[PDB]
Paper text:
The Microrchidia (MORC) family of chromatin-remodelling ATPases is pivotal in forming higher-order chromatin structures that suppress transcription. [name] possesses multiple DNA-binding sites that undergo structural rearrangement upon DNA binding. Importantly, [name] mediates chromatin remodelling via ATP hydrolysis-dependent DNA compaction in vitro, regulated by the phosphorylation state of its CTD.
We determined a 2.4 Å cryo-electron microscopy (cryoEM) structure of full-length [name] [name]-dead mutant (MORC2S87A) in the presence of AMP-PNP. The presence of AMP-PNP density near the ATP lid in MORC2S87A model, confirmed that this mutant can bind but not hydrolyse ATP, mimicking S87L variant where some residual [name] activity is still detected. [name] mutant had similar DNA binding affinity as wild-type [name], indicating that ATP binding did not affect [name] DNA binding. We found that MORC2WT compacted DNA into a large DNA cluster, whereas MORC2S87A, MORC2N39A, MORC21-603 and MORC2604-1032 variants did not. Our investigation of the [name] [name] mutant based on the patient variant S87L, which retains ATP binding but has significantly lower [name] activity, showed significantly slower DNA compaction than MORC2WT.
Numbering used by the authors:
A (entry chain B): 4 to 87, 94 to 307, 339 to 510, 519 to 551
B (entry chain A): 4 to 87, 95 to 307, 339 to 510, 521 to 551
The structure:
Amino acid sequence: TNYSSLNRAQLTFEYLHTNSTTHEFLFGALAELVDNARDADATRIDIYAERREDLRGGFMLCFLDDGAGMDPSDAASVIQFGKASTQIGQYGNGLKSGSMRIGKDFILFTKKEDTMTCLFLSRTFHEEEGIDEVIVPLPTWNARTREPVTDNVEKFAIETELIYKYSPFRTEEEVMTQFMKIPGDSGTLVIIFNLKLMDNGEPELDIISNPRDIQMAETSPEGTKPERRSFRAYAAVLYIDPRMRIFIHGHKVQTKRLSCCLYKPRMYKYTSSRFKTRAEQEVKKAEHVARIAEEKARAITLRREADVKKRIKEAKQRALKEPKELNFVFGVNIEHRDLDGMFIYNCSRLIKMYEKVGPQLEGGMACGGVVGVVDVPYLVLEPTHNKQDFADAKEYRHLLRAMGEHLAQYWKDIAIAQRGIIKFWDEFGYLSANWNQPPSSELRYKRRRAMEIPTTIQCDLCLKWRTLPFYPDTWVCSMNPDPEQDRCEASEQKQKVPLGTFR
Amino acid sequence: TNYSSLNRAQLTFEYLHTNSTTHEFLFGALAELVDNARDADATRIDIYAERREDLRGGFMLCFLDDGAGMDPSDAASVIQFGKATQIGQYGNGLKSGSMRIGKDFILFTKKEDTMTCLFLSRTFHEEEGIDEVIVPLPTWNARTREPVTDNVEKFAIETELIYKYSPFRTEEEVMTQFMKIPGDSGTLVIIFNLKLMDNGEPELDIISNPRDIQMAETSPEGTKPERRSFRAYAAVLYIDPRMRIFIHGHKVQTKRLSCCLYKPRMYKYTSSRFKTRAEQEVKKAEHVARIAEEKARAITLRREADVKKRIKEAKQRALKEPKELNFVFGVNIEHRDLDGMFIYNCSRLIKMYEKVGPQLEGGMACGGVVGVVDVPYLVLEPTHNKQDFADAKEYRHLLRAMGEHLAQYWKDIAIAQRGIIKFWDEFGYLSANWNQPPSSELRYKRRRAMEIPTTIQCDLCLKWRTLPFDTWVCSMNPDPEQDRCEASEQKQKVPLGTFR
Ligand SMILES: Nc1ncnc2c1ncn2[C@@H]1O[C@H](COP(=O)(O)OP(=O)(O)OP(=O)(O)O)[C@@H](O)[C@H]1O
Ligand SMILES: Nc1ncnc2c1ncn2[C@@H]1O[C@H](COP(=O)(O)OP(=O)(O)OP(=O)(O)O)[C@@H](O)[C@H]1O
Ligand SMILES: [Mg+2]
Ligand SMILES: [Mg+2]
Ligand SMILES: [Mg+2]
Ligand SMILES: [Zn+2]
Ligand SMILES: [Zn+2]
């Protein structure tokens, strides 16, 4: 029947702040926007600051990527909280969750073939007009000749006047400047302004102490990881396979696959029952809706609905033939021994980092300096609201216990206890007895550390990860000294890791 | 001007699951419903499991309280995401928690001459393909049980939707849940079609302990009881519990955790963050108040300006209050291994067993010390799940201040002079291990018993009485000064402490 007269769960002003409160990690709030840029299939995100002293915080936070962009339908689907194979976005709210943690308002400029769209979700408009609902101006211009593209001219006029009133771009030419800030035919520019302040009135994002970095505006104690104080260090290891370049203030971050930056990286295949059970659970949930859709078609659109969903059922049963094991990669961190811990990636995105499991939890000299990296998929684990924890805490703890057992196995097979922990760390540049000090940066110790680590670097245009046989600049495969991968059309040489057997 | 034709941000079906994903702590998801019942000024919540084999999980999860209840207006404001000395300020927590526990939830509330059902069912949206979040909202008169609505076809659709997807398939089956509220005002929240684990069992274990709601897992010896037992979690969920928590009809022995500690000393820490956030709160609310009075100078703007100056006059009285943070530190002697900081935000527990200061270092000193702070809402705000804090920098500043106050407390309590291993072993901890419980021998049990005063709560007046030595009344208090329910409530006389 018709439910037009029934009550609907609506949105209010304060729920933007409520959605903002999930991020105790403001770098996680940034990380959700760069996640959306990765979901755009972008080759490059520029995360730069535009100095605007008239706004709160003194500057805007602009997120410019060259991705697929958005049509008016997808742009209208942003403010629909929630959505309808390797993408990060599954919750449909994380842009709104992050941008309100970062700043009071955010304005989104995007472009996709001949339609380019502005999304101006403004909390300052809601304060200054006292409107309880979440009213979002969404005007669309033609991407070539710039006429308004809408079915409601007075609605377009109201939206654009609202943008020129509360946006940092008070004119249509200043809007067009942000629209041609996107260089390609498609892309998205997300500008977050009126940033959150501390008690002293300074913005939380420190962009002044390091001009090539977005920093946490606080002091740095001894035991604080650089990923929680530096967004450069966070975005370097934010992805388990970073194909898209990230530019902070126009400077590319040296991203790294954490498995290749480890001494003796051994790979472990852990057959997870959580992998197998929910892979078997998703095939009956998909077959249940396929049965009711088939009898619904048993007119043309209902038949086509079941026909294009029948191939979805063939895809998930094909995935059952793939073995349900998890890739446990363990390697010793020699460049920083103290920056060890477990780096849990969920569908190639860092959720939990620097986690101590197994004998790392025990207070003791051994099993320290090991970095464990895993890419769990979405059917094994789902992220939390902030994508900094895991929703299934019980099987997350099961994963941590299994990874502790695999850590103990990795520690006993590489035989550091047989060869000596103390002299092993002494010969690798670590002379002081303190754990948290960086190693000695002399020439022989630096060459000893860099001899074990293969130098991996990413090209600028083909975006492939090359290896060099003994704030980065722009790098192409042409100046690779290795003649096997001296061209951009060469196949990307995958990381080769020794295999370890656990029990 | 008018913005009726302008686009609005909407809610979709999958946002209920997205909102549900904020609760890594399922006991936090339960605790949000307990928080809403505390905001109801309920004297008693009832947490009970109604066994229903036709639903997922095998049983219903019921949240019955005798609070203020809801009228149709604030019952409709429940599904308005984001609303409002109350814990609830995010307008979200019931919707996040109930969808963390179960696929659907049906809410029965009653207030004054009216009573209202709130059905929000993800089963209805799944079986009907509904993209939006459609909530049936019928309202009955609390005496005559007639439909109180201006749209009888909408009422018929809402009620038939409840009878189709709710566990209560008839009007009489709905009415049984409506008279399950005993008083004139109250709220019954039913969570059904609960989330299963990998083995198909529900996540909430109600079978191993029939008086408790537990995590359905094998618990190692390092697990805190509040992370695996909802009875132990709701015992310390509030810093001043006037609620009577009832789990499966059994009253939870709640406690203010400060008085259950050996030698508790109080530290009044002057927080500059408390002073600074109060100093911007005074300048912000009058700015809203002065522009509300200008526009009201048409009757709706005066009502907005009257409640704005009510807030504006309230905070000016609170600025002259001493902007200090009350740090309470005590030694946990019934369980040495269950130590750590218990940070309460607006009298609601957020962080449990936080090791700060010398507890961070793996070592023998400052072990067994439990710190308790009632952080106001002016200092910090909770996260989406209310299991962390939004301001991580100021939370870490608070933790460092609590660490240095822990060091001050440790040098104050003179365990630095009376021996470290001679103090713990005479208190029942003969073993060299850390995580084992103390000795159950009678002289050690009585030695631990006489230090902590027995602070237990009456059932009618809800006051906390101390015994000098079940369902308990102030009449069988052996103390002659507090043998009646009309007696003045006696606070804990915890001595003050000074730093440096
Ligand atoms: N910069 C961008 N480029 C392309 N698409 C974008 C961009 N930002 C947002 N989107 C799209 O906008 C929609 C809504 O954004 P949002 O980030 O809230 O959703 P989501 O990525 O699906 O969610 P989440 O990350 O919480 O799972 C998504 O479909 C997302 O793909
Ligand atoms: N058992 C209850 N008794 C009385 N009022 C209730 C009850 N449960 C919910 N409510 C009301 O429901 C409204 C919205 O519910 P919700 O719990 O999401 O809001 P909130 O408590 O303000 O939010 P939060 O706790 O996340 O800050 C609140 O204003 C609250 O008063
Ligand atoms: Mg997203
Ligand atoms: Mg593009
Ligand atoms: Mg709430
Ligand atoms: Zn190349
Ligand atoms: Zn009494």
